[PDB]
Amino acid sequence: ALEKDRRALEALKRAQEAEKKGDVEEAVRAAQEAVRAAKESGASWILRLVAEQALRIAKEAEKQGNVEVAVKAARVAVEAAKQAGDNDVLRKVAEQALRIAKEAEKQGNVDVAAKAAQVAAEAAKQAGDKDMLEKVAKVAEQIAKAAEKEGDKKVSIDATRIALEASLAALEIILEELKEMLERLEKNPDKDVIVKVLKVIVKAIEASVKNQKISAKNQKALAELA
Amino acid sequence: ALEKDRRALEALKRAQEAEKKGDVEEAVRAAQEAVRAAKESGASWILRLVAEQALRIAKEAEKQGNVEVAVKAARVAVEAAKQAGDNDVLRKVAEQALRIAKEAEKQGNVDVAAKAAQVAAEAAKQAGDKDMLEKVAKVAEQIAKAAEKEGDKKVSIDATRIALEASLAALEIILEELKEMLERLEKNPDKDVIVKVLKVIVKAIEASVKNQKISAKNQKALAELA
Amino acid sequence: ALEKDRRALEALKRAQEAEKKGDVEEAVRAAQEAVRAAKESGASWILRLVAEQALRIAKEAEKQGNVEVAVKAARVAVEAAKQAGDNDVLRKVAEQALRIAKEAEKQGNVDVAAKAAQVAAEAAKQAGDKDMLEKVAKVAEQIAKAAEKEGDKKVSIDATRIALEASLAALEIILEELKEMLERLEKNPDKDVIVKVLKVIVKAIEASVKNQKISAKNQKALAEL
């Protein structure tokens, strides 16, 4: 709260050596202790550095391939921002985790591509971004179809699960926006408000039908296993 | 009339004598013979007794614990109340089975608890009580969450299946209520009727999201099996 | 031409002579050769002729009562009409594959009935007929209930999967009709257009509930093992 943040800054001082070099071993070890010691302190002012530093170690991990360790750095980034409560960094980690997922898809590593999609769905859910959640759901659907071609089934089933959980979360946000527009129509009836509510109902039916579309894929994946 | 029916009332007295003597097991065996002879006669009047009588045996067990015998008596009650067609008794069977299911959950027997939550669902769907069907789902979710901690995974799948079939039955009722409101919208196109139809659609979508969220939680219970 | 091609035309002629003879069984074997060679040509038409000819083999196999051969004839017709387009040919196959499904029923062959319902759901989904896809999903439900009464559980799971796929396909088509109705509401927003949009919204929710009902039964079958 007040008397243990200095232990994290010195753990951040032992972390920033990976700027001149490209070491990922000491970068993930320092990121583990940084996001850990900062979370127990509960000081959102030290969580803003470890979250931004994790974006710096994940950006360098994105270079030179290294997608296997880039997701481990984005996992640290989302854990720091999830407990801090900042909505802007969660949107940046979500968009950056999508790159790690699309890169790992090209690298042939669907396991890392799925793990990067989970982090992308992890930050987008907590931040409440409906446009990002549906995007993570469609990226996880491509990883699932890619794993189906790779004959993996291990990641394909987990990729549909992330696609379903991401699209289900976006369906809740649209549902909340529809009930916010419903209470606005109350005590204020108008043809312009009715049209605005009808447009949200269509968006909700669109997110529901796509959610059932992903739901049938996850049942299809489970049916191939059993 | 007087045969294949007198045998039903004799089984009721054989059950009534057991309730005062004890051993509710023998009371259910008599109530099982009663509902069998009552269903053969097809008299809705005798079916209301064996239903309300078997309900009494279920409450006799509740104080004695023995939730295994309570569900057997609640299944006889819901089977007799279903063939009779009296929704008042079916609404009482649903509430009593929720009690047995919550007590079997406190006792740790989540298997009997799920069987009781199934009996509660059977009664609430036959009577057409959406407010009870949504209530049954809440309990069947609690039993599923309870089966998660106990390690009994087969019950967790069966409990989420029951929470799904209850939410599904509630969605059909709201869908029927929506088609009646759409029927009153075809006649007299009015701004006030539109607001009421818009109000039901949001409730139908909100129930659909709750059903797809229960379905997603059920598929999560299926993907956990290694 | 001559090479690669023509091999399908001569196979179709052998099929036409087999239809005149009424062997039907051999007619499917030649038609299988014809649709494979026509895919090698990758040419519009030819396939269109193989699709329309194979339908006739499936029609005369209904008169013969050989529903087993009829589902292979419709499988070649749905595979040829899929590559050639012409959704009126696909709609013609789905109508014939449902007739095969009902004829496969009642006789007792629920496995072939499931194969016929898949073909009907294959054509109607490609053509985009929600009224046929809904009709395929209802017949696939009749196969699943009958497969339970006959005792074969593997066919019952396959029948519910086809029922869900044809029901999910029709739900996507109705969603597109609703999006088109919403865009017409944005350009002309008044009471009468709102009434028609709300009428489609009810049809979209009614299909969504019927799709979730089949999804739950497929999950129940997946809960086993």
XYZ file of C-alpha atoms in Angstrom:
677
model
C 0.000 0.000 0.000
C 2.804 2.402 0.942
C 5.958 0.654 2.253
C 6.635 -2.041 -0.375
C 6.545 -0.249 -3.751
C 10.295 0.467 -3.675
C 10.899 -3.288 -3.831
C 9.113 -3.255 -7.201
C 10.972 -0.260 -8.663
C 14.267 -2.010 -7.932
C 12.751 -5.080 -9.594
C 11.951 -2.768 -12.516
C 15.543 -1.498 -12.453
C 16.771 -5.092 -12.795
C 14.281 -5.466 -15.680
C 15.160 -2.592 -18.046
C 18.551 -4.168 -18.916
C 16.748 -5.827 -21.859
C 16.721 -2.532 -23.781
C 20.227 -2.669 -25.265
C 20.069 -6.472 -25.477
C 17.256 -8.755 -26.588
C 17.188 -11.126 -23.629
C 13.810 -12.743 -22.950
C 14.852 -15.032 -20.076
C 15.618 -12.245 -17.600
C 12.791 -10.198 -19.138
C 10.079 -12.724 -18.261
C 11.573 -13.488 -14.832
C 11.615 -9.789 -13.938
C 8.111 -9.392 -15.381
C 6.908 -12.242 -13.151
C 8.215 -10.622 -9.965
C 7.169 -7.136 -11.102
C 3.493 -7.869 -11.786
C 3.424 -10.050 -8.658
C 4.988 -7.667 -6.130
C 3.085 -4.723 -7.623
C -0.295 -6.471 -7.382
C 0.066 -7.217 -3.663
C 1.088 -3.611 -2.989
C -2.111 -2.371 -4.621
C -0.562 0.891 -5.860
C -2.008 1.673 -9.291
C 0.877 4.108 -9.873
C 3.421 1.265 -9.964
C 1.068 -0.919 -12.031
C 1.163 1.640 -14.861
C 4.897 1.092 -15.394
C 4.914 -2.717 -15.238
C 2.014 -2.717 -17.707
C 3.796 -0.335 -20.085
C 7.144 -2.079 -19.562
C 5.442 -5.384 -20.380
C 4.312 -3.798 -23.649
C 7.943 -2.822 -24.248
C 9.261 -6.335 -23.592
C 6.440 -7.833 -25.679
C 7.137 -5.473 -28.585
C 10.795 -6.530 -28.654
C 9.675 -10.136 -28.167
C 7.399 -9.629 -31.176
C 10.517 -8.788 -33.179
C 13.004 -11.563 -33.998
C 10.115 -14.028 -34.024
C 9.931 -15.133 -30.377
C 6.145 -15.451 -30.374
C 6.414 -18.154 -27.699
C 7.719 -15.602 -25.178
C 5.704 -12.657 -26.537
C 2.481 -14.184 -25.185
C 4.132 -14.708 -21.791
C 4.918 -10.976 -21.778
C 1.389 -10.008 -22.836
C 0.038 -12.312 -20.121
C 2.021 -10.210 -17.646
C 0.729 -7.025 -19.296
C -2.935 -8.004 -18.972
C -2.513 -9.186 -15.369
C -1.104 -5.807 -14.324
C -3.805 -3.825 -16.142
C -6.630 -6.119 -14.997
C -5.914 -5.295 -11.343
C -5.009 -1.642 -11.962
C -8.302 -0.772 -13.649
C -7.059 1.382 -16.545
C -9.267 1.074 -19.621
C -6.822 2.585 -22.114
C -3.979 0.109 -21.572
C -6.415 -2.818 -21.683
C -7.421 -1.743 -25.193
C -3.747 -1.525 -26.181
C -2.904 -4.955 -24.748
C -5.962 -6.413 -26.493
C -4.953 -5.025 -29.893
C -1.323 -6.019 -29.309
C -2.277 -9.545 -28.235
C -4.174 -9.906 -31.519
C -0.929 -9.234 -33.390
C 0.839 -11.920 -31.345
C -1.998 -14.293 -32.237
C -1.945 -13.464 -35.955
C 1.858 -13.725 -36.031
C 1.859 -17.080 -34.218
C -0.759 -18.311 -36.691
C 1.704 -17.644 -39.516
C 4.524 -19.168 -37.439
C 2.520 -22.411 -37.400
C 2.197 -22.278 -33.588
C -1.558 -22.366 -33.009
C -1.032 -23.059 -29.293
C 0.689 -19.702 -28.777
C -1.815 -18.159 -31.197
C -4.652 -19.415 -28.991
C -2.915 -18.266 -25.797
C -2.465 -14.810 -27.330
C -6.166 -14.766 -28.225
C -7.073 -15.573 -24.612
C -5.062 -12.576 -23.400
C -6.764 -10.521 -26.116
C -10.159 -11.708 -24.872
C -8.983 -11.228 -21.276
C -8.281 -7.506 -21.657
C -11.179 -6.747 -24.014
C -13.685 -8.334 -21.617
C -12.530 -6.369 -18.564
C -12.390 -3.121 -20.561
C -15.862 -3.559 -22.057
C -14.940 -3.151 -25.735
C -17.633 -4.846 -27.820
C -15.834 -4.171 -31.110
C -12.637 -5.786 -29.805
C -14.378 -8.791 -28.220
C -16.079 -9.778 -31.474
C -12.746 -9.266 -33.250
C -11.016 -11.640 -30.823
C -13.842 -14.122 -31.426
C -13.298 -14.057 -35.195
C -9.516 -14.335 -34.807
C -9.945 -17.352 -32.531
C -12.274 -18.824 -35.157
C -9.481 -18.566 -37.737
C -7.020 -20.208 -35.335
C -9.582 -22.974 -34.820
C -9.972 -23.546 -38.563
C -6.178 -23.450 -38.904
C -5.747 -26.071 -36.180
C -8.423 -28.186 -37.884
C -6.203 -28.185 -40.975
C -3.138 -28.893 -38.819
C -4.961 -31.928 -37.400
C -4.249 -30.795 -33.834
C -7.694 -30.878 -32.140
C -5.987 -29.964 -28.858
C -5.840 -26.265 -29.740
C -8.822 -26.353 -32.118
C -11.221 -27.136 -29.264
C -9.585 -24.526 -27.023
C -9.689 -22.007 -29.888
C -13.449 -22.401 -30.314
C -13.858 -22.056 -26.542
C -12.066 -18.696 -26.635
C -14.073 -17.683 -29.706
C -17.305 -18.582 -27.895
C -16.336 -16.888 -24.625
C -15.311 -13.737 -26.508
C -18.510 -13.544 -28.564
C -20.682 -14.327 -25.537
C -19.068 -11.438 -23.649
C -19.724 -9.037 -26.533
C -23.346 -10.220 -26.518
C -23.660 -9.086 -22.895
C -22.354 -5.590 -23.683
C -24.845 -5.219 -26.541
C -27.591 -6.464 -24.218
C -26.630 -3.828 -21.644
C -26.695 -1.107 -24.308
C -30.155 -2.283 -25.385
C -31.511 -1.981 -21.838
C -29.881 1.447 -21.543
C -31.794 2.488 -24.670
C -34.971 0.868 -23.328
C -35.041 2.971 -20.148
C -34.421 6.052 -22.315
C -37.556 5.258 -24.327
C -39.385 5.185 -20.995
C -40.625 8.644 -19.966
C -39.435 9.817 -23.418
C -41.326 8.060 -26.233
C -40.401 9.138 -29.747
C -40.188 7.663 -33.230
C -36.494 8.594 -33.356
C -35.873 6.694 -30.119
C -37.828 3.682 -31.413
C -35.605 3.556 -34.503
C -32.478 3.765 -32.345
C -33.735 0.873 -30.207
C -34.632 -1.178 -33.290
C -31.081 -0.709 -34.574
C -29.721 -2.068 -31.288
C -32.127 -5.033 -31.345
C -30.804 -6.017 -34.776
C -27.228 -5.722 -33.500
C -28.186 -7.935 -30.552
C -29.813 -10.533 -32.807
C -26.726 -10.346 -35.028
C -24.441 -11.018 -32.055
C -26.734 -13.801 -30.821
C -26.900 -15.613 -34.171
C -23.125 -15.375 -34.520
C -22.808 -16.610 -30.929
C -24.933 -19.645 -31.759
C -22.842 -20.053 -34.919
C -19.727 -20.342 -32.746
C -21.655 -22.543 -30.310
C -22.348 -25.098 -33.045
C -18.643 -25.080 -33.946
C -17.644 -25.870 -30.352
C -20.143 -28.741 -30.307
C -18.745 -29.891 -33.659
C -15.234 -29.854 -32.187
C -16.408 -31.850 -29.165
C -18.205 -34.288 -31.480
C -14.999 -34.942 -33.436
C -13.192 -35.859 -30.205
C -15.874 -38.162 -28.773
C -64.330 -46.810 -11.148
C -64.487 -49.189 -8.178
C -61.783 -51.623 -9.343
C -58.289 -50.653 -10.500
C -59.207 -47.610 -8.365
C -59.985 -49.067 -4.930
C -56.516 -50.610 -5.215
C -55.188 -47.052 -5.530
C -56.892 -45.821 -2.352
C -55.772 -48.958 -0.503
C -52.193 -48.065 -1.438
C -52.819 -44.556 -0.097
C -53.909 -45.931 3.286
C -50.935 -48.307 3.228
C -48.853 -45.158 2.725
C -50.763 -43.090 5.302
C -50.208 -45.776 7.945
C -46.483 -45.783 7.138
C -46.172 -42.008 7.583
C -47.378 -42.230 11.187
C -45.410 -45.424 11.886
C -42.211 -44.279 10.174
C -40.130 -45.858 7.420
C -41.044 -43.462 4.623
C -39.475 -45.994 2.246
C -42.513 -48.248 2.665
C -44.762 -45.197 2.271
C -43.269 -44.418 -1.149
C -43.549 -48.050 -2.267
C -47.256 -47.806 -1.454
C -47.434 -44.407 -3.163
C -45.729 -45.967 -6.189
C -48.429 -48.649 -6.288
C -50.993 -45.870 -5.813
C -49.845 -43.728 -8.745
C -49.632 -46.860 -10.904
C -53.231 -47.872 -10.181
C -54.419 -44.254 -10.343
C -52.859 -43.671 -13.770
C -54.507 -46.842 -15.101
C -57.930 -45.570 -14.004
C -57.389 -42.171 -15.618
C -59.389 -40.309 -12.959
C -58.005 -36.810 -12.400
C -59.645 -36.770 -8.957
C -57.684 -39.713 -7.531
C -54.580 -38.310 -9.223
C -54.900 -35.149 -7.120
C -54.852 -37.213 -3.914
C -51.864 -39.443 -4.738
C -50.060 -36.276 -5.832
C -50.881 -34.325 -2.665
C -50.412 -37.456 -0.549
C -46.963 -38.210 -1.988
C -46.139 -34.553 -1.346
C -46.817 -35.183 2.345
C -44.404 -38.139 2.384
C -41.831 -35.817 0.804
C -42.216 -33.394 3.713
C -42.021 -36.279 6.203
C -38.584 -37.121 4.801
C -37.466 -33.473 4.756
C -37.496 -33.348 8.558
C -35.875 -36.809 8.655
C -33.316 -35.880 5.990
C -33.266 -38.968 3.752
C -33.407 -36.830 0.617
C -33.183 -40.016 -1.463
C -36.695 -41.039 -0.425
C -37.949 -37.455 -0.723
C -37.138 -37.286 -4.448
C -38.749 -40.688 -5.027
C -41.888 -39.289 -3.370
C -41.543 -36.015 -5.284
C -41.272 -37.933 -8.564
C -44.477 -39.815 -7.734
C -46.083 -36.463 -6.900
C -45.044 -34.777 -10.153
C -45.983 -37.843 -12.219
C -49.454 -37.934 -10.663
C -49.930 -34.164 -10.899
C -48.882 -34.206 -14.566
C -51.507 -36.739 -15.667
C -54.164 -34.958 -13.594
C -53.603 -31.580 -15.241
C -54.005 -29.409 -12.129
C -51.423 -26.626 -12.383
C -51.953 -25.653 -8.731
C -50.453 -28.928 -7.498
C -47.654 -28.811 -10.083
C -46.633 -25.369 -8.806
C -46.517 -26.821 -5.281
C -44.454 -29.824 -6.427
C -41.917 -27.497 -8.056
C -41.409 -25.454 -4.878
C -41.128 -28.570 -2.706
C -38.560 -30.140 -5.040
C -36.497 -26.944 -4.855
C -36.482 -27.350 -1.070
C -35.322 -30.972 -1.320
C -32.678 -29.959 -3.867
C -31.350 -27.199 -1.609
C -31.272 -29.544 1.394
C -29.537 -32.296 -0.582
C -27.002 -29.631 -1.580
C -26.406 -28.757 2.079
C -26.055 -32.494 2.761
C -23.385 -32.906 0.069
C -25.382 -35.358 -2.082
C -25.384 -33.342 -5.291
C -26.574 -36.389 -7.258
C -29.891 -36.516 -5.404
C -29.882 -32.706 -5.514
C -29.772 -32.741 -9.320
C -32.507 -35.384 -9.481
C -34.612 -33.109 -7.276
C -33.854 -30.097 -9.478
C -34.974 -32.203 -12.443
C -38.267 -32.956 -10.678
C -38.620 -29.227 -9.998
C -38.110 -28.543 -13.707
C -40.612 -31.199 -14.822
C -43.327 -29.611 -12.673
C -42.629 -25.989 -13.609
C -42.631 -26.715 -17.354
C -45.934 -28.614 -17.238
C -47.665 -25.825 -15.296
C -46.184 -23.100 -17.504
C -44.590 -21.064 -14.688
C -41.771 -18.996 -16.180
C -40.988 -17.367 -12.822
C -40.528 -20.845 -11.340
C -38.606 -22.173 -14.355
C -36.057 -19.357 -14.082
C -35.924 -20.100 -10.350
C -35.179 -23.788 -10.980
C -32.295 -22.750 -13.237
C -30.771 -20.688 -10.419
C -30.817 -23.740 -8.151
C -29.497 -26.098 -10.845
C -26.622 -23.646 -11.362
C -25.860 -23.761 -7.631
C -25.806 -27.570 -7.713
C -23.482 -27.456 -10.726
C -21.156 -25.042 -8.935
C -21.388 -27.314 -5.886
C -20.562 -30.393 -7.974
C -17.491 -28.553 -9.293
C -15.949 -28.236 -5.829
C -16.827 -31.811 -4.824
C -15.193 -33.278 -7.933
C -18.385 -35.018 -9.097
C -18.154 -33.969 -12.751
C -20.982 -36.159 -14.075
C -23.406 -34.285 -11.818
C -21.967 -30.948 -12.983
C -22.883 -31.869 -16.566
C -26.323 -33.129 -15.529
C -26.959 -30.042 -13.382
C -26.074 -27.639 -16.204
C -28.261 -29.724 -18.516
C -31.152 -29.174 -16.098
C -30.391 -25.459 -15.752
C -30.381 -25.325 -19.555
C -33.689 -27.151 -20.067
C -35.317 -24.879 -17.474
C -34.028 -21.675 -19.075
C -35.047 -23.075 -22.468
C -38.587 -23.722 -21.216
C -38.715 -20.176 -19.839
C -37.610 -18.835 -23.228
C -40.449 -20.685 -24.972
C -42.954 -19.043 -22.616
C -41.599 -15.560 -23.337
C -41.580 -16.437 -27.042
C -45.257 -17.356 -26.729
C -45.923 -14.122 -24.837
C -44.121 -12.257 -27.627
C -46.261 -13.829 -30.356
C -49.408 -12.820 -28.464
C -48.167 -9.222 -28.248
C -47.218 -9.314 -31.930
C -50.761 -10.575 -32.535
C -52.124 -7.504 -30.729
C -49.720 -5.398 -32.818
C -51.034 -6.638 -36.169
C -54.379 -5.355 -34.903
C -54.440 -1.645 -34.021
C -50.943 -0.417 -34.979
C -50.344 2.003 -32.093
C -47.393 3.808 -30.534
C -48.361 2.401 -27.131
C -48.574 -1.155 -28.489
C -45.138 -0.722 -30.086
C -43.601 0.258 -26.738
C -45.089 -2.865 -25.151
C -43.838 -5.071 -28.000
C -40.408 -3.435 -27.731
C -40.523 -4.143 -23.987
C -41.173 -7.866 -24.500
C -38.486 -8.251 -27.180
C -35.794 -6.971 -24.811
C -37.032 -9.447 -22.201
C -37.029 -12.243 -24.788
C -33.481 -11.345 -25.849
C -32.327 -11.019 -22.227
C -33.656 -14.527 -21.569
C -31.966 -15.773 -24.749
C -28.621 -14.376 -23.576
C -29.129 -16.106 -20.222
C -29.861 -19.360 -22.058
C -26.786 -19.086 -24.283
C -24.690 -18.273 -21.209
C -25.942 -21.430 -19.485
C -25.281 -23.398 -22.679
C -21.741 -22.002 -22.826
C -21.194 -22.993 -19.192
C -22.444 -26.494 -20.025
C -20.016 -26.830 -22.942
C -17.272 -25.652 -20.585
C -18.226 -28.572 -18.336
C -17.901 -30.917 -21.324
C -14.506 -29.579 -22.436
C -13.012 -30.174 -18.966
C -13.187 -33.965 -19.448
C -9.677 -35.035 -20.455
C -11.738 -31.486 -75.434
C -11.159 -35.130 -76.428
C -8.481 -35.416 -73.740
C -9.604 -35.074 -70.103
C -13.012 -33.864 -71.325
C -15.429 -36.132 -73.253
C -14.685 -38.858 -70.684
C -17.550 -37.405 -68.645
C -19.856 -37.227 -71.676
C -19.266 -40.891 -72.523
C -19.851 -41.835 -68.887
C -23.112 -39.888 -68.943
C -24.119 -41.748 -72.106
C -23.372 -45.075 -70.407
C -25.536 -43.847 -67.538
C -28.320 -42.891 -69.956
C -28.198 -46.385 -71.455
C -28.195 -47.840 -67.940
C -31.301 -45.768 -67.174
C -32.987 -47.080 -70.328
C -31.999 -50.555 -69.158
C -33.138 -49.674 -65.629
C -30.032 -51.003 -63.878
C -29.723 -47.718 -61.941
C -27.015 -49.244 -59.745
C -24.506 -49.204 -62.596
C -25.883 -45.810 -63.637
C -24.613 -44.363 -60.354
C -21.188 -45.933 -60.917
C -20.923 -44.283 -64.332
C -22.279 -41.005 -62.951
C -19.597 -41.125 -60.250
C -17.048 -41.335 -63.066
C -18.810 -38.494 -64.883
C -18.859 -36.016 -61.990
C -15.195 -36.688 -61.205
C -14.133 -36.097 -64.807
C -16.315 -32.983 -65.022
C -14.538 -31.604 -61.952
C -11.262 -32.194 -63.797
C -12.608 -30.111 -66.681
C -13.860 -27.544 -64.171
C -16.382 -26.397 -66.773
C -19.802 -24.843 -66.318
C -22.457 -27.086 -67.853
C -21.589 -30.781 -68.312
C -21.841 -30.856 -64.524
C -25.233 -29.188 -65.040
C -26.112 -32.153 -67.259
C -24.689 -34.674 -64.779
C -26.653 -32.990 -61.987
C -29.919 -33.176 -63.940
C -29.267 -36.743 -65.113
C -28.364 -38.050 -61.647
C -31.653 -36.617 -60.384
C -33.431 -38.902 -62.851
C -31.497 -41.916 -61.539
C -32.619 -40.949 -58.035
C -36.225 -40.522 -59.203
C -36.414 -43.952 -60.849
C -34.671 -45.481 -57.827
C -37.595 -44.255 -55.724
C -40.003 -46.126 -58.013
C -37.763 -49.186 -57.696
C -37.716 -48.528 -53.950
C -33.911 -48.743 -53.710
C -33.424 -45.872 -51.281
C -29.809 -46.975 -50.784
C -28.960 -46.319 -54.443
C -31.129 -43.186 -54.461
C -28.971 -41.515 -51.802
C -25.838 -42.115 -53.884
C -27.553 -40.697 -56.974
C -28.585 -37.579 -55.055
C -25.074 -37.332 -53.593
C -23.622 -37.089 -57.103
C -26.327 -34.606 -58.108
C -25.746 -32.382 -55.071
C -21.982 -32.543 -55.619
C -22.258 -31.656 -59.320
C -24.822 -28.876 -58.841
C -22.724 -27.410 -56.013
C -19.763 -26.766 -58.323
C -21.861 -25.585 -61.285
C -24.090 -23.208 -59.328
C -27.630 -22.845 -60.698
C -29.469 -22.788 -57.365
C -32.686 -23.962 -59.035
C -30.907 -27.266 -59.661
C -29.795 -27.379 -56.021
C -33.371 -26.643 -54.922
C -34.484 -29.516 -57.165
C -32.010 -31.861 -55.448
C -33.057 -30.868 -51.921
C -36.710 -31.537 -52.761
C -35.719 -34.969 -54.074
C -33.393 -35.726 -51.152
C -36.228 -35.051 -48.699
C -38.502 -37.413 -50.630
C -35.730 -40.013 -50.358
C -35.526 -39.264 -46.629
C -39.241 -39.893 -46.079
C -39.036 -43.024 -48.238
C -35.959 -44.109 -46.284
C -38.128 -43.642 -43.209
C -41.077 -46.004 -42.688
C -38.999 -48.686 -44.429
C -36.683 -48.715 -41.398
C -33.347 -47.452 -42.813
C -32.615 -44.507 -40.532
C -28.933 -44.423 -41.523
C -29.746 -43.780 -45.185
C -32.452 -41.355 -44.040
C -29.768 -39.416 -42.165
C -27.633 -39.466 -45.318
C -30.554 -38.171 -47.394
C -31.305 -35.381 -44.910
C -27.652 -34.302 -45.038
C -27.829 -34.074 -48.841
C -31.033 -32.030 -48.625
C -29.343 -29.762 -46.076
C -26.283 -29.606 -48.342
C -28.201 -28.356 -51.385
C -30.620 -26.015 -49.607
C -27.809 -24.392 -47.613
C -25.795 -23.786 -50.786
C -28.849 -22.501 -52.672
C -30.070 -20.384 -49.752
C -33.621 -21.669 -49.228
C -34.715 -21.015 -45.648
C -38.082 -22.667 -46.332
C -36.339 -25.860 -47.446
C -33.680 -25.718 -44.719
C -36.476 -25.433 -42.158
C -38.162 -28.368 -43.900
C -34.894 -30.326 -43.777
C -34.447 -29.614 -40.065
C -37.957 -30.891 -39.313
C -37.333 -34.139 -41.206
C -33.963 -34.538 -39.480
C -35.833 -34.304 -36.168
C -38.142 -37.097 -37.344
C -35.056 -39.202 -38.093
C -33.567 -38.534 -34.648
C -36.746 -39.529 -32.801
C -37.133 -42.619 -34.998
C -33.474 -43.537 -34.484
C -34.181 -43.457 -30.747
C -37.188 -45.749 -31.218
C -35.075 -48.106 -33.343
C -32.249 -48.006 -30.790
C -29.354 -46.806 -32.964
C -27.843 -43.913 -31.010
C -25.098 -43.093 -33.525
C -27.733 -42.226 -36.132
C -29.636 -40.152 -33.559
C -26.580 -37.988 -32.862
C -25.935 -37.593 -36.590
C -29.593 -36.688 -37.174
C -29.597 -33.988 -34.491
C -26.368 -32.528 -35.900
C -27.997 -32.230 -39.329
C -31.120 -30.726 -37.747
C -28.986 -28.112 -35.991
C -26.999 -27.286 -39.143
C -30.105 -26.809 -41.296
C -31.682 -24.791 -38.466
C -28.564 -22.655 -38.007
C -28.371 -22.037 -41.761
C -31.983 -20.838 -41.922
C -31.399 -18.606 -38.888
C -28.526 -16.887 -40.702
C -30.721 -16.348 -43.767
C -33.496 -14.795 -41.677
C -30.898 -12.583 -39.982
C -29.857 -11.288 -43.406
C -33.494 -10.595 -44.287
C -33.763 -8.640 -41.031
C -30.622 -6.621 -41.789
C -32.114 -5.811 -45.192
C -35.377 -4.816 -43.489
C -33.481 -2.614 -41.029
C -31.735 -0.762 -43.858
C -35.116 -0.166 -45.500
C -36.352 1.145 -42.142
C -33.464 3.625 -41.910
C -34.337 5.146 -45.294
C -38.130 5.206 -44.740
C -38.819 5.314 -40.977
C -42.530 5.322 -40.128
C -45.174 3.202 -38.403
C -45.960 0.879 -41.319
C -42.300 0.006 -41.916
C -41.700 -0.479 -38.181
C -44.580 -2.973 -38.127
C -42.860 -4.990 -40.856
C -39.477 -4.803 -39.115
C -40.990 -6.007 -35.828
C -42.703 -8.812 -37.749
C -39.304 -9.965 -39.018
C -37.769 -9.563 -35.540
C -40.347 -12.021 -34.193
C -39.524 -14.442 -37.015
C -35.827 -14.030 -36.191
C -36.395 -14.723 -32.489
C -38.754 -17.620 -33.226
C -36.067 -19.252 -35.373
C -33.402 -18.478 -32.767
C -35.401 -20.318 -30.095
C -36.007 -23.287 -32.403
C -32.278 -23.320 -33.131
C -31.344 -23.253 -29.444
C -33.828 -26.064 -28.778
C -31.961 -28.294 -31.235
C -28.589 -27.133 -29.887
C -29.576 -28.266 -26.387
C -30.568 -31.729 -27.624
C -27.240 -32.020 -29.444
C -25.433 -31.003 -26.245
C -27.438 -33.638 -24.361
C -26.231 -36.272 -26.825
C -22.688 -34.889 -26.506
C -22.965 -35.157 -22.714
C -22.774 -38.917 -23.267
C -19.050 -39.767 -23.228
